[PDB]
Amino acid sequence: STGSATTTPIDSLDDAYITPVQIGTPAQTLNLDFDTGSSDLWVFSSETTASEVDGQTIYTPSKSTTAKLLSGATWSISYGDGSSSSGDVYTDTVSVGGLTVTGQAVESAKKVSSSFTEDSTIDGLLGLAFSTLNTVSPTQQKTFFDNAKASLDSPVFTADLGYHAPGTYNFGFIDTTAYTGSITYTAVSTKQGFWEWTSTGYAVGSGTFKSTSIDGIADTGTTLLYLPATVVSAYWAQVSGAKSSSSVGGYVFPCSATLPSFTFGVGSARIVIPGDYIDFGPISTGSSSCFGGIQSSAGIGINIFGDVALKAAFVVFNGATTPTLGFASK
Numbered sequence: 001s002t003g004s005a006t007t008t009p010i011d012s013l014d015d016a017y018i019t020p021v022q023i024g025t026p027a028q029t030l031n032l033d034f035d036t037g038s039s040d041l042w043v044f045s046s047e048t049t050a051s052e053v054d055g056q057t058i059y060t061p062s063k064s065t066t067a068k069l070l071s072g073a074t075w076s077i078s079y080g081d082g083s084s085s086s087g088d089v090y091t092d093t094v095s096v097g098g099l100t101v102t103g104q105a106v107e108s109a110k111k112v113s114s115s116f117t118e119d120s121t122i123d124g125l126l127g128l129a130f131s132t133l134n135t136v137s138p139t140q141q142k143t144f145f146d147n148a149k150a151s152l153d154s155p156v157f158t159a160d161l162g163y164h165a166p167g168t169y170n171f172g173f174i175d176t177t178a179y180t181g182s183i184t185y186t187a188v189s190t191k192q193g194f195w196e197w198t199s200t201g202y203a204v205g206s207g208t209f210k211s212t213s214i215d216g217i218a219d220t221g222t223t224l225l226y227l228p229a230t231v232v233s234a235y236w237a238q239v240s241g242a243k244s245s246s247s248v249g250g251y252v253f254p255c256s257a258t259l260p261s262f263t264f265g266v267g268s269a270r271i272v273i274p275g276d277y278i279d280f281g282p283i284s285t286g287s288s289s290c291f292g293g294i295q296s297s298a299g300i301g302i303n304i305f306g307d308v309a310l311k312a313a314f315v316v317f318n319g320a321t322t323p324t325l326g327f328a329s330k
């Protein structure tokens, strides 16, 4: 079997991407944030505290004739960005672009932090990292991808995020028309439960490519590109007036600037991120200072190849016996 769904930016800055998911019987369509950096499928629901719901579509397990309460199971998750959510668990039928999983754990939220409440367009998350990170206790649950893998034509999912435009998440197949040139595959470590790979280096604009090992994760659930301070400083040093601001919490640059591109290595291949992808608009409404799309991972502990980097590429998440990551230009 296969599945194909359109993913769309939630706003004019591509701050996140939402993809419709059908849950239950009859179908209840929620727009979820497909997250390759986490492993819980969780949703805003009829059980979420009234004050913590602001415009999101909710999942009502009681109106789903296939929803089964997973007895004594609870989930609680804290993300790198400080946001959190928690609640109880149902098993239900879940479909993504025509690919169906029966008995998928749907984690129903009782509590969400304010960061989730303020994003009216994000109805929950669909975790696509390795099932070892799943927070369901006392019995861990598998991801949608893990549940479908046996049924899939090929054990893969692809991420094709758009810049200021719609994109696609495909399951079970590789769309050979969605990229140019070839897909370069690279090794993956699943020890931390993430799609963790090693980039072979980088370049700023038309500068000479620097061969250096950058370990990081392919994370669709993180908006920006988080890299070592040496790397990020070399990038922002090319932007006139750019500086690291402690008040704003990152590198800012004049909104009138035309940014240089950023290239990252995948083996001997190169993915070029156009400069416009790195502009995240005014730091505050009406400001002529803009927020940068390339930030330092020094406070994080891990380098993150988020949407800023992934949207410049056609990305294959190969869930073969030994998982790997594929990247092609598009």
Ligand SMILES: NCCN1CCOCC1
Pocket: 015, 016, 114, 115, 116, 118, 119
């Ligand atoms: N609510 C703050 C975080 N979110 C994250 C996703 O993009 C929009 C802003």
